[PDB]
Amino acid sequence: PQITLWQRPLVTIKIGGQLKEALLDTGADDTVLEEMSLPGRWKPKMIGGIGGFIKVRQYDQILIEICGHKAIGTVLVGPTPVNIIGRNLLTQIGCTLNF
Amino acid sequence: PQITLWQRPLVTIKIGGQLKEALLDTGADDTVLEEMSLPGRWKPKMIGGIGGFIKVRQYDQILIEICGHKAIGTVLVGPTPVNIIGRNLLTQIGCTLNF
Numbered sequence: 760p761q762i763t764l765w766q767r768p769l770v771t772i773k774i775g776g777q778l779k780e781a782l783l784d785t786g787a788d789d790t791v792l793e794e795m796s797l798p799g800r801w802k803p804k805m806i807g808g809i810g811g812f813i814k815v816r817q818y819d820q821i822l823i824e825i826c827g828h829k830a831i832g833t834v835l836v837g838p839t840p841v842n843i844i845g846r847n848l849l850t851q852i853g854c855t856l857n858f
Numbered sequence: 859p860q861i862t863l864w865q866r867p868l869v870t871i872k873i874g875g876q877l878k879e880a881l882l883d884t885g886a887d888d889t890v891l892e893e894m895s896l897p898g899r900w901k902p903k904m905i906g907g908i909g910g911f912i913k914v915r916q917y918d919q920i921l922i923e924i925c926g927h928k929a930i931g932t933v934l935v936g937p938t939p940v941n942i943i944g945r946n947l948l949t950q951i952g953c954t955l956n957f
């Protein structure tokens with residue numbers, strides 16, 4: 760579809776059988792979700808953004824559905840104020856910026 | 859043009875007669891630029907990012923050219939790791955997300 764930016768580009772995503780709201784963020788290199796439980800091993804990591812860095816748990820090869828489109832990739836879990844879908848997954852669903 | 863997301867969507871912007879690179883950021887409500895000098899009075903604003911909140915200087919009706927597209931709007935100046943072109947300006951140049 761074509762999503763305008765008059766409002767925040769929020770979409771529904773499905774991960775681990777849970778339905779959640781997330782922001783399509785072209786400014787984010789990675790995907791970061793609110794604290795939740797995921798299967799498998801994880802690695803500690805620090806990610807920075809506006810306001811500084813936060814500590815997150817890194818899980819690889821996680822399956823996520825974005826507006827029907829399935830995508831696999833790394834997902835970071837931590838104290839983020841909003842769920843962020845970054846470029847690592849945006850590319851997988853063929854999302855592009857146009858003007 | 860059509861921009862893919864395999865790399866950061868960095869573009870060249872012109873402001874105050876100078877060229878700088880910035881990120882087309884759909885995850886940002888506002889446009890935030892690294893410390894610089896701008897004309898006029900400024901007002902205070904507190905913005906929140908992934909790592910917390912930071913104080914910035916708000917300048918209004920600032921002319922900024924993004925990839926040949928002229929825009930005039932509000933720009934925030936503060937301690938940001940990178941220049942960010944937010945939705946307030948992306949809408950002015952007709953930018954949309956597609957997939």
Ligand SMILES: CNC(=O)[C@@H](NC(=O)[C@H](OCc1ccc(-c2cccnc2)cc1)[C@H](O)[C@@H](O)[C@@H](OCc1ccc(-c2cccnc2)cc1)C(=O)N[C@H](C(=O)NC)C(C)C)C(C)C
Pocket residue numbers: 782784785786787788789791806807808809840841843881883884885886887888890905906907908939940942
């Ligand atoms: C390498 N690091 C990244 O790639 C990081 N990217 C960013 O932070 C992007 O910024 C560019 C950027 C790129 C690289 C580095 C970097 C770092 C270290 C080293 N090198 C480069 C630093 C910044 C984002 O799109 C940013 O813009 C946006 O984040 C999403 C968001 C939206 C709403 C609330 C939110 C907060 C409070 C209430 N409601 C919502 C909280 C967060 C955000 O903070 N939006 C704000 C917003 O819209 N707030 C409402 C505006 C005002 C900026 C990711 C790991 C998340």
